[PDB]
Input
Amino acid sequence: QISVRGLAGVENVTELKKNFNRHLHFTLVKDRNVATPRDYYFALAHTVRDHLVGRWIRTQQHYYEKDPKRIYYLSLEFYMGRTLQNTMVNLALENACDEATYQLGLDMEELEEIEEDAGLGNGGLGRLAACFLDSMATLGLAAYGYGIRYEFGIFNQKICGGWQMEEADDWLRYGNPWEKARPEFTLPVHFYGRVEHTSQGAKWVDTQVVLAMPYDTPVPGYRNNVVNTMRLWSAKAPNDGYIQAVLDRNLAENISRVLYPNDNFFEGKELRLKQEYFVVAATLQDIIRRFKSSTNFDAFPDKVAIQLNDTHPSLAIPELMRVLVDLERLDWDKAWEVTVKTCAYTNHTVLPEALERWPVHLLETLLPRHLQIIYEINQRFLNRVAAAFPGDVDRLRRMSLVEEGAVKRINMAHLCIAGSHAVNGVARIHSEILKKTIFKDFYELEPHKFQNKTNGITPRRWLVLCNPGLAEIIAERIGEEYISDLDQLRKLLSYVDDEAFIRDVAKVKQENKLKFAAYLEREYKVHINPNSLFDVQVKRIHEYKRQLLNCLHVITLYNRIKKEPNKFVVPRTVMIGGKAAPGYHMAKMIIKLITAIGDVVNHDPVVGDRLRVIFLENYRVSLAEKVIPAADLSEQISTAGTEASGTGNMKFMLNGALTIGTMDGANVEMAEEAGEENFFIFGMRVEDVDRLDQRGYNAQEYYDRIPELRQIIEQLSSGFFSPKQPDLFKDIVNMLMHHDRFKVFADYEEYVKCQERVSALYKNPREWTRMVIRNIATSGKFSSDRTIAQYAREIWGVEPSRQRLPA
Amino acid sequence: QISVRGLAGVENVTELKKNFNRHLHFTLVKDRNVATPRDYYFALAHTVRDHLVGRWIRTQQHYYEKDPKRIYYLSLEFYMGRTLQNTMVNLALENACDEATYQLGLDMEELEEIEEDAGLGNGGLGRLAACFLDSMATLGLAAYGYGIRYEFGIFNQKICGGWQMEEADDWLRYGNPWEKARPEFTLPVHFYGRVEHTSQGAKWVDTQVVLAMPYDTPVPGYRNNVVNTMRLWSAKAPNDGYIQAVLDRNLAENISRVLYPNDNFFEGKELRLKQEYFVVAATLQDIIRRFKSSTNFDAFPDKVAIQLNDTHPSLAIPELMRVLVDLERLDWDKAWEVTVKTCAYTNHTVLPEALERWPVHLLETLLPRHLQIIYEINQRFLNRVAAAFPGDVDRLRRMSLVEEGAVKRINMAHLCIAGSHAVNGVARIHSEILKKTIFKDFYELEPHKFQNKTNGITPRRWLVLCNPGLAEIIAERIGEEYISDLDQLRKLLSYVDDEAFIRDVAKVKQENKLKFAAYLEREYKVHINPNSLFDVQVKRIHEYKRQLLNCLHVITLYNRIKKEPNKFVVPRTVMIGGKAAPGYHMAKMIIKLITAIGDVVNHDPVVGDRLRVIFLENYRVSLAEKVIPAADLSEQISTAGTEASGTGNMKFMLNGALTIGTMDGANVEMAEEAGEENFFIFGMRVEDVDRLDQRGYNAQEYYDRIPELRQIIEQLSSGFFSPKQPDLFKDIVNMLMHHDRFKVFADYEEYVKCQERVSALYKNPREWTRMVIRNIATSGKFSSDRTIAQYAREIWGVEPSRQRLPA
Ligand SMILES: O=c1c(O)c(-c2ccc(O)c(O)c2)oc2cc(O)cc(O)c12
Ligand SMILES: O=c1c(O)c(-c2ccc(O)c(O)c2)oc2cc(O)cc(O)c12
Output
């Protein structure tokens, strides 16, 4: 049908069809008279998964045979999304399956909508894990993803009366055809107990046991026959009155029941700590077994890299030490050398509320041996700080793994830096901020530890998959190589005055917009004007991301229209979407304000279809693949210094939106790649935020000097956006006026003015589209292949590769 | 290899082999270098299940097409055992798979030992359900089994220090290849709430919802291409702080977590009541849907029979009424007519402690609408009793569904009789006892309600499967027809003086004994003498079954040997096995006494291999298939009047053991079938037990008059069988001396004397074996095909059939 989708070979189609029917009859036990589309999806899913197994067994067999260094990507979150399309695309079976399902009288796309997201993540950090597994398989690395198989992923969000309601994300209800259960490789994990010193060694005794049962999911590289593994652990009660004892097996099985729904926020809950130890202990036994199956650990860092995605599996460090010292009888010093050289740590935020700082009492109880090891680590590490900086005792107290206070805590970031050979941030500004501020003392001690690794996104899911029309028009001019060599998109600059390309680019955007508008009307009965500018902010709801600043802009547009009804303005559909953490009262109030603004704006007959505001419900990876290709303006308006990188930013750039943003995170590099003249950059830079902090931020000043701002705040206080409950938003108002950590009012004027520049350009379609070309053509750096190649060469010590395995 | 096992066709073998390899590669994702026997079992299991699906879909499709009356067998227990061998035998694929697995270098029998029992039952009543599904499919009935899919079946029993220890029967750990999940046919069940009377009707509102998810298992008939369904419901929380709310989904899912482990004993636990309503509500919605999918219910009893296996799903009666009256708007009278004609009830014991008698307060809370309906039922039913027996008010209070007392209760048996058109016992003596005693008032009101249906066992599992050697020697003389026409075994009487048959019968027994002895030594390192008489009592541990009486006999044999060491006695290996309910202190003490007797007996050098006592651990359906074909003497020694039927009795008769027993349950019919002269019948008859009850049972009398008995009791009291804990068995002694409901001492002398007759015969091998022939040849009545044909003609109103469906 379209070329980037591959060949619908005649044998291939004929084979797929009968394999479809075979699974429908034997696997599903259905005939065509009773089968639902759901059965059809599953038949197709089984059929497609059979095409991997040959490669899946050979890839793993090949790593047994050639013994390369193995990379273990350890994360509490893998935000995988759907798997069916992605698997077809990476195996080159998309047109063949589309034709085969067509010949059976089925619409493949309709079938794809049946698959549940594997929503085992919150947002950026979990999706990065997902993009990384893709890129590592595409670059031929012997890489494993290790995580938890949550029974319930990130909650499904409903909006009732304009408010978020959470419900269980029961993603496994109808089964998961992609995973293979491996109960035969189940492993014991220990909790509680107490420590005995004998000789030989310390001994961790009287523990409770939880079993960890692995489930393996395949991870296919792009057209290279590589199929790596994502292994996720599931919690199981041990083998060994009566009814209550059987029922009490749930307590241990609750360890993998549900993903904690906090994006960038630390809650010190014991269950969360258990989940972190559970993934770390099970994983490290796997790693060690595999290493032995090729008891002298000199070579262990040449054969193993363990990458820590945030501090969440930071326990890997004292766990590896525990195994090496207590079970393998290595001297401490050798063990530590091995540990540091095996581990590396990635930081994803500088915001203090995200820092993991576990109470010492809690670790003492749940993991007594690990606390002792942490103390010994801290002593030797601070001994090093003393030798390097004699007499600097404040530096000692600041660098310590132990925080003194009402409650003594362990700082997990400090543990990670001490126990890792490399520490990285996720965009250049962020990595520099780390060296200047929170990790400055650690930087001065060990400067060659500290690196940058700018994030990326996979151009498979985030272009070929979600926007096949754009991928096609690009392939038509430059071939298909850019798909795994995204720097080739720079060749599109030579088309910035090509009339046919300019036309094709606009036509593809317009098709994405028409299609997205159809989705909304079909699945939610909401009418959007398809000739409006699609203005979109999609990401988790937080104060630092400044959805409220968007809110102030939206209401400004409304009040401007009402003051001068007859003045032309570019129509917009302003879309905001994302989940709030269940406990974050402020976040929930903001979602409510967005829907409340909609209640006025969308029913004002003077405004009509010139301005609509909609809250996109249940933002998740599959909804991202729909709305991002339809977008005109990408809102990326975080307070300078707060967004470590962002990745949603990159998706929009890749898919033909222009960006309005602050110089924060990877926005800085994106503007550098495209030319600043091709970005709507506004607001304080980091330096200016600091100057404001030095002086004191006083919101009242901005209110007193900006009449349009004053009018919005008064509308909020007096009840204009909540007539029945006039004080409904007093908490938002008070925060804005007196406790705004993110300085919303200080960027208001520059933001509104920059938004005027956006509209001005949109009035000139031709020049809008030429600027878009200049963005797409410079998005190549933001491929996760680039990012992962940098991890492999600069941290892991492995060489990536583009060569096929046998067919 | 052997003929009854079927043809190893060359194409068939070639096809099985590649399907084996296909599943190993695609389903299991394994190659032959890493595969465990466990993987091989699963590959074989998937391969074998593919051979059913053609027939499975056509059978169900055929019942849609011909609309016969459907039979719904409703039970809280389906004691299915293993499925792999049974499926091969019923499809005629046993030799073909054996040859195919042989050609792959695999031992099929070894593979079969990997499969877990589906142990979703306690004992007799659950196995009967299992045998019935087999026989109904073999007789061509459109029959469904409806039950609960317990996550944990009957507990696995370990014996530590001679004591029972229970652990979770985690039967689903490695998956179940036989079932197909049907989450798409999930259904809501309601609990709690309260009743509103509007008009139209009563309304049950404010309920909590539990979802019921069906899993379908195939049930293949013997070589007739019929494949019926066993549907088992599994509990699921409804779709709709946050973490605790997700975790609290377990409370509702606990409904199907674990089988209650009480054999013949009522515990009034709310969770058990919930399980009973859950199976009944889900099942009845299925039934009604299916009936509508062919809203006038005149024909509903012509299209539906619901059979109640004990009172456990007795709620079916007020549930069917609730649906018909409240949801379908039928007048009460018509609804009741439909209900009585749809339902029938099977009783399995007369022991009062087994009677379900639920507190009115509990039903009021959990099932308010059902309590009201029960009250209305009771009123109209007692109105009938008054018209038939004017002025007999004691009869009214005795017959009432409501028991008055400190706690008001509902008598579920009384509900069943009132709401059913047929009530049956499970052996002729038992059915007569019901009419004479506990149900006498109900018999006088409605005599044509009351029937007998003598139990049976399936000759597939219980002969062809478990004892292929015996089945072969029988087939060699009479052909294979007896396999589904077990009355043909009477032709074996003409061989009672055939020298070759006498030899073959003894040779087969001897092979079963050698093999069982090998099992015990391999899997437990216990040495048994294979030229000893294998004396076996296997069944649940209860006082009424009188394992203690066996205990007294065993110790008598020991004391006799010690008193006269040089006198010849026939060597025996005395085997006792079975589970005690976790809470039944007495039952647990008895298991302990058996092992304690072993501790003395088996280490006395004067006894040596002349007498051994072993406690067979973890008696379950698969262990029954091993030990029953190896047995010489079948112990069936319950107090006359207490064992409603028994079915273990029948297994032993079928498999070439002779029986020592009381005239109780189906023992009476078995002796009638074979001739009493071919049974070791001893002890009080029912009549004699009654006379003893009239006079008062005084144990002391038997103790004072029987020196050998006195010596055993003194050995028990003084600590001979527990030197370290001399008073260990004082509770057993005291029960025997002062509270023995089952009158152990009263049958002691006759039992010991009858056991002397057994030994005397065993000394004459030829005449032992001729008596065995006379037993086997008269076991035909005890086929479950016979039983089910009687249910179909005399209760359900359907005609059984022996004809094939298309290939
Ligand atoms: O807008 C979209 C839409 O509605 C569907 C869809 C949903 C349900 C169905 O049953 C169906 O056939 C298609 O898919 C999409 C896929 C995209 O990549 C982008 C989109 O904008 C849509
Ligand atoms: O005694 C028996 C025995 O040991 C086995 C067995 C167990 C484990 C194995 O691995 C194996 O190959 C065979 O099966 C049996 C099957 C019967 O029907 C009867 C028996 O008496 C045995």
